[PDB]
Amino acid sequence: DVGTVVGIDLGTTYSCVGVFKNGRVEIIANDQGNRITPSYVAFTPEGERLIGDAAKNQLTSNPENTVFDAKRLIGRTWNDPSVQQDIKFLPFKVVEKKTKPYIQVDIGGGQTKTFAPEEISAMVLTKMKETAEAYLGKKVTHAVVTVPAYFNDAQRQATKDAGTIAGLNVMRIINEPTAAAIAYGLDKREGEKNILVFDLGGGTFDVSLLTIDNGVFEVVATNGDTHLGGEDFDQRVMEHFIKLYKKKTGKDVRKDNRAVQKLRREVEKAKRALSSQHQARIEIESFYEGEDFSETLTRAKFEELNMDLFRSTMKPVQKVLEDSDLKKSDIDEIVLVGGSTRIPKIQQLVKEFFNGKEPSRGINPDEAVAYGAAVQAGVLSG
């Protein structure tokens, strides 16, 4: 009937899919061997449609026809002031169509097409569905899908709609921070608890005050920063090296985007390394005008380059507490979500904010939301 239902984190920057198999949640790897998949769609001049890692990986040679951040636009009208702000920063065309912000791309050979934001997310969701189905060795028809807690009626419906386009019946839309809590078993626990969820993604920062009472969740207050994430930490590190280069050679890397992008790729990997190691080597062969890049980033440097950004995450946490009439002591559970929460310095800051109190631990913070979504998908068959 519903078959094996899947749990999908449909993220602004990365998506994740899980399933309940053999008494356990399995987070599923994609055709590229990754347990997270970029929420990107690229159309090539030859007319190929890329989704996920291959869309993300080419993109530097294709800014106009590579689509991301559709989640910023889904469920919104063209004239929403938020949309009008966002599209300033997007490198693809967005036009007014049927009152909505439609994405216009060159599909190949100069052929122009428009897509509703839920059409682009449907392509991503189709990628998640194939990832799942290859794992399971069978077709999937039903899904649990997560959304931010601040999502309104239209944004929830448009996500359901993206699922229907993708061949998915979205049985449950769940809030992302609730899914995270579920992954940690916090919905089981007896009596009333206040849960702070701190979700530092690749492009957005979400803080949520949740209440659990008899396995029923209530979102009391949300804050954060719509345009803060790990990518902002990457950018800081580029500017540092482009500056060091424009000092050691006189040359300016920004004249060549391909150089700037190659730096971006290596910075990303260095950033991930610095969560485990204390130094990382950034080495780009044939980086600008045949010449080579070697420099080495320390964790101490990474942190200094980002310290004000790291510190600015605490102010939404204070506002959330204020808006919900609670103080630090009132928090019984801290859940970290997002790849950036693996940054050792961000963990230190959250703990010190809460007076030495430890967060929940044991689930990859990139995977926690889909995990919880898979916990509920699990119950929806059996």
Word description of this protein:
- With 382 residues, the chain is α+β, with helices and mostly antiparallel strands.
- It has 4 domains: 1-67 and 124-188 and 361-382, Nucleotidyltransferase, domain 5 (2-Layer Sandwich), CATH 3.30.420; 68-123, Defensin A-like; 189-228 and 313-360, ATPase, nucleotide binding domain (Nucleotidyltransferase, domain 5, 2-Layer Sandwich), CATH 3.30.420.40; 229-312, Actin, Chain A, domain 4 (Alpha-Beta Complex), CATH 3.90.640.10.
- It is 36% helix and 27% strand.
- The protein is built from 11 helices and 18 strands.
- The protein has helices spanning 53-58, 81-86, 117-136, 153-165, 176-183, 230-248, 257-273, 299-312, 314-323, 344-353, 368-380; strands at 6-9, 14-21, 24-27, 37-38, 41-43, 49-51, 66-67, 93-97, 100-106, 112-115, 142-147, 169-175, 193-200, 205-213, 216-225, 279-288, 291-298, 333-337.
- Strands 1, 2, 3, 4, 11 and 12 form a 6-stranded mixed β-sheet that branches. Strands 15-14-13-18 form a 4-stranded mixed β-sheet, with helices on both faces.
- Helix 5 (176-183) packs across helix 11 (368-380).
- The N and C termini lie close together (11 Å).
